[PDB]
Ligand binder design. Structure first.
Ligand SMILES: Cc1cccnc1-c1csc(C(=O)Nc2cc(Cl)cc(NS(C)(=O)=O)c2)c1
Ligand SMILES: Nc1ncnc2c1ncn2[C@@H]1O[C@H](COP(=O)(O)OP(=O)(O)O)[C@@H](O)[C@H]1O
Ligand SMILES: [Cl-]
Ligand SMILES: [Mg+2]
Length: 857
């Protein structure tokens, strides 16, 4: 397209030149002829040792969860024996007195894992490492940590027991901690606790179990595994990347500290790979009753329901022994869609069998669960009189999650519309019927075009077998697979482990913070090492950020980014926010990326109230900051004022509260890295009037989400950095409500995630000026004297000197970030030479700097 004309005043051009001259910053001079354009853009003590995370056993005067001495109260001097006796007696009394708890223990003693209690405890006592293998629903997760704890309590060694249980999912760590507390007559906070990203309930310091995500454990290993007797690594068969990484750390720990106890727990898969990795450790097999399950495929499903679709490809392939209508009907179904209407027809077929039982439906993600749910409540046959239809995904509230376990009024059918959470991590009771979409949801990132694909993909044969088996724990069962018999044949046996297909920059920072050695050298020792290109891309990413120096050693910037649990690029954006004294707002934007949107839109275009949060800034990120300011104001009135605020504005309160908490924790980590309190205060802003603080926040957001820049042609059509076409996401404040066109005062936009569906979509969009483009959303800039070319995709008609001056500001800003990370309290100093540079960036963040007044039309 035509080069875009930047309207830069003479006053500003000279101000830019003066600041570059005052500070003696290097500029590239204009070119000689327009056919040779010029680019405007221009060590610590290594070791090769393989470090080991140190280990030390529980100690009576040590709180292993807070990693500090017990100083106050009786536990500071109390002997192990005193502590063990008290806890032993406390437990014996509770079990004599509580009739409801006695009934709960009776349920426990009937779980299949119960009969193996002795064999498991003998195996753990005799071996540094063991594997416990058995079917989903035996009681590995809920029972085994209690068996170990109760073994120590009942043998007068309560004080010698502290257990870490890792789960691959946030929802599993929380849920399991709530379930195990309930099984012990408690709420989390006594014998059991949980620690996940941005939320914890710490257990008591003694004879306690902490359920956590691996990320939390790795972030807390900076001082070693101190005061812990057992590490239980759960659901290893999921090949969660962080679990694979932790298995490398714990193998080194075991070797150097054989008194530690590691316990790996697996579904029924081949565990020889893990077994061999951990020096041929014992495998304790665990099993109970299972019933046979009749399994059906798409063609079987079409025949027994007489179903007829509306008006390579394994739906055109069907065996001779099926009817000509089955073949014809199957052949009409797109394999990339899930057939909602066939599922409806399968629930009705199940009614005719007259055997009571719950139906578990496996759907890839929340998008198809919502769609299947709405589809059913359209037909009044699927109302409360006959049907309890419950969604199960990680984002439904925990109140709603528990309801999938509740019994149901006689003559009502429980239907769980579930993600693969219900494949191996939880067991819904009363399940006799499984409908399997035969799909998985996976996050695929591609670094080269910065494309996120929430892709719907074929499941493995091993997933289909596990899904089939969820129908066969109560009585003989049925599994209705919605893929052809000819698609089944082409299925891989296992999923690609996440280590093969996930970015490694966060794992790389953890390796460096924990001093485990070289990134490539440590990942080479993984059970299944990641591919070379992923390691090369991680090192390259952390080197562009200046998280690693020339020697690939941790910079002081690296150390901060490693300690912040968000994307490193966002960590660096928060340091820059601190330097500009807008820390709180940049911490809010970073925290919000870890949680679903607070707006309850229901996959439709935002209406008036949601759009009003945007002001005149054409920015989803400003909409979010304005929501958080209004919500925090309405919260002063108390809980009911907060609930009413969130109901009247259609906002998810739980999302607003978790984001705020996450923001509080991010800020605490910067405080502890030496950042001054007063660069992180909440600052009132307006989303319509002049606001230099908000101008700077939007500049810093361009940096954060780079390389996500786009150019708006017309309507919803945008051009991405690959020269390719894309759509403004329906959910954006920048998406036209109807046919009235938006009059953007700039065509340039930054966005959260570039999404591949059928088209390329920009989601969470913020308008930026051409000046902000050049300062923070540009890696490479070539000038011919008249026209500059930005990252080989878009052209500005702008002065050469202005573009070179803005590029030199970016470099000055990078060099200040390096200085500030060595010595964060220089933010306080407000040194005059830095202030001169910062004030010029403050000035070119103004909409007025690029000829724009957002208050006019
Ligand atoms: C609230 C608070 C006040 C003061 C200090 N700390 C916390 C805290 C917040 S979360 C948290 C945690 O998760 N600690 C934690 C988890 C895990 Cl999974 C293990 C181990 N112990 S260790 C390293 O393995 O020896 C320790 C502690
Ligand atoms: N929240 C809960 N409500 C009711 N029953 C539950 C709950 N959580 C777990 N259970 C039951 O506990 C039993 C054992 O589950 P679990 O320990 O997860 O087994 P495993 O880890 O071996 O698959 C199952 O029958 C399951 O249904
Ligand atoms: Cl950049
Ligand atoms: Mg389990």
């Amino acid at each position: 397209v035509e080069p875009y004309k930047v309207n830069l005043s003479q006053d500003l051009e000279h101000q830019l030149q003066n600041v570059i001259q005052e500070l003696n910053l290097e500029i590239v001079p204009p070119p000689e002829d327009p056919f040779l354009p010029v680019v405007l853009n221009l060590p610590s003590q290594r070791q090769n040792q393989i470090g080991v995370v140190p280990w030390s056993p529980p100690q009576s005067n040590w709180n292993p969860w807070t990693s500090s001495n017990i100083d106050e109260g009786p536990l500071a001097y109390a002997t192990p024996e005193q502590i063990s006796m008290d806890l032993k007696n406390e437990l014996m009394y509770q079990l004599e007195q509580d009739h409801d708890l006695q009934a709960i223990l009776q349920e426990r003693e009937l779980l299949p894992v119960k009969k193996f209690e002795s064999e498991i405890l003998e195996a753990i006592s005799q071996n540094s490492v063991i594997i416990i293998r058995g079917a989903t629903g035996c009681g590995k997760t809920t029972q085994v940590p209690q068996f170990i704890l109760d073994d120590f309590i009942q043998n007068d060694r309560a004080a010698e027991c502290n257990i870490v249980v890792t789960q691959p999912r946030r929802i599993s760590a929380v849920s399991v901690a709530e379930r195990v507390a309930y099984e012990r007559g408690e709420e989390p906070g006594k014998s059991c606790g949980y620690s996940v990203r941005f939320e914890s309930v710490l257990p008591r310091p003694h004879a306690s179990i902490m359920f956590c995500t691996v990320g939390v454990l790795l972030r807390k290993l900076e001082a070693g595994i101190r005061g812990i007797s057992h590490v239980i690594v759960d659901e290893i068969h999921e090949r969660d990347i962080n679990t694979d990484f932790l298995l490398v750390v714990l193998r080194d720990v075991v070797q150097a500290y054989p008194e530690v106890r590691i316990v790996l727990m697996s579904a029924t898969i081949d565990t020889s790979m893990f077994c061999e990795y951990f020096f041929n450790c014992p495998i304790i097999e665990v099993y109970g009753r299972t019933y046979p399950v009749q399994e059906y495929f798409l063609e079987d499903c079409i025949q027994m329901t007489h179903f007829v679709p509306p008006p390579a490809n394994c739906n055109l392939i069907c065996g001779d022994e099926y009817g000509p209508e089955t073949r014809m009907s199957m052949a009409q179904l797109n394999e990339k869609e899930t057939p909602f209407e066939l599922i409806e027809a399968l629930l009705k077929y199940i009614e005719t069998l007259n055997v009571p039982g719950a139906v578990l439906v496996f759907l890839p993600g929340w998008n198809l669960i919502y769609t299947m749910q709405k589809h059913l409540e359209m037909n009044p046959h699927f109302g409360s009189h006959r049907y309890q239809i419950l969604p199960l995904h990680s984002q439904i509230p925990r109140e709603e999650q528990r309801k999938v376990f509740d019994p149901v009024p006689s003559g009502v059918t429980k239907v769980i519309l579930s993600t693969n959470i219900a494949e191996t991590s939880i067991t819904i009771n009363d399940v006799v019927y499984v409908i399997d979409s035969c799909k998985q949801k996976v996050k695929l990132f591609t670094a080269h075009n910065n494309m996120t694909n929430y892709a719907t993909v074929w499941a493995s044969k091993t997933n289909l077998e596990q899904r089939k088996g969820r129908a066969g724990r109560v009585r003989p069962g049925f599994c209705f697979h919605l893929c052809s018999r000819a698609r089944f044949e082409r299925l891989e046996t296992h999923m690609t482990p996440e280590m093969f297909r996930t970015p490694l920059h966060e794992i790389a920072l953890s390796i460096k913070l924990l001093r485990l050695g070289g990134i490539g050298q440590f990942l080479a020792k993984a059970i299944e090492p990641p591919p070379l290109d992923a390691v090369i891309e991680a090192e390259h990413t952390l080197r562009e950020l200046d998280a690693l120096d020339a020697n690939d050693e941790l910079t002081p910037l690296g150390r901060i980014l490693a300690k912040l649990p968000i994307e490193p690029r966002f960590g660096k954006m928060m340091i820059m926010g601190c330097i500009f004294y807008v820390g709180d707002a940049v911490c809010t934007i970073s925290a919000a990326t870890c949680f679903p949107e607070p707006f309850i839109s229901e996959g439709k275009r935002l209406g008036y109230v949601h759009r009003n949060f945007a002001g005149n800034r054409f920015s989803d990120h400003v909409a979010l900051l304005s929501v958080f300011q209004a919500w925090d104001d309405a919260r002063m009135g108390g809980e009911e004022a907060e609930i009413r605020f969130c109901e009247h504005k259609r906002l998810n309160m739980a999302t607003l509260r978790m984001t705020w908490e996450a923001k509080v924790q991010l800020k605490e980590i910067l405080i502890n890295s030496g950042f001054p309190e007063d660069c992180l205060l909440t600052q009132v802003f307006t989303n319509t009037g002049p606001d230099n603080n908000l101008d700077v926040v939007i500049s810093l957001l361009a940096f954060g989400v780079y390389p996500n820049v786009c150019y708006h042609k017309e309507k919803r059509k945008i051009l991405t950095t690959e020269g390719r076409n894309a759509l403004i996401h329906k959910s954006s404040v920048n998406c036209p409500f109807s046919s009235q066109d938006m009059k953007y005062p700039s065509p340039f936009f930054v966005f959260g995630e570039k999404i591949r569906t059928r088209a390329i979509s920009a989601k969470g969009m913020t308008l930026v000026t051409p000046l902000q483009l050049l300062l923070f959303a540009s890696k490479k800039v070539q000038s011919d004297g008249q026209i500059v070319l930005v990252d080989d995709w878009i052209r500005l008609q702008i002065s050469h000197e202005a573009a070179a001056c803005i590029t030199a500001l970016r470099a000055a800003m990078e060099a200040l970030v390096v200085e500030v990370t060595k010595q964060p309290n220089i933010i306080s100093q407000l040194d005059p030479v830095n202030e001169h540079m910062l004030n010029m960036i403050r000035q070119i963040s103004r909409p007025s700097a690029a000829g724009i007044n957002l208050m006019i039309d």
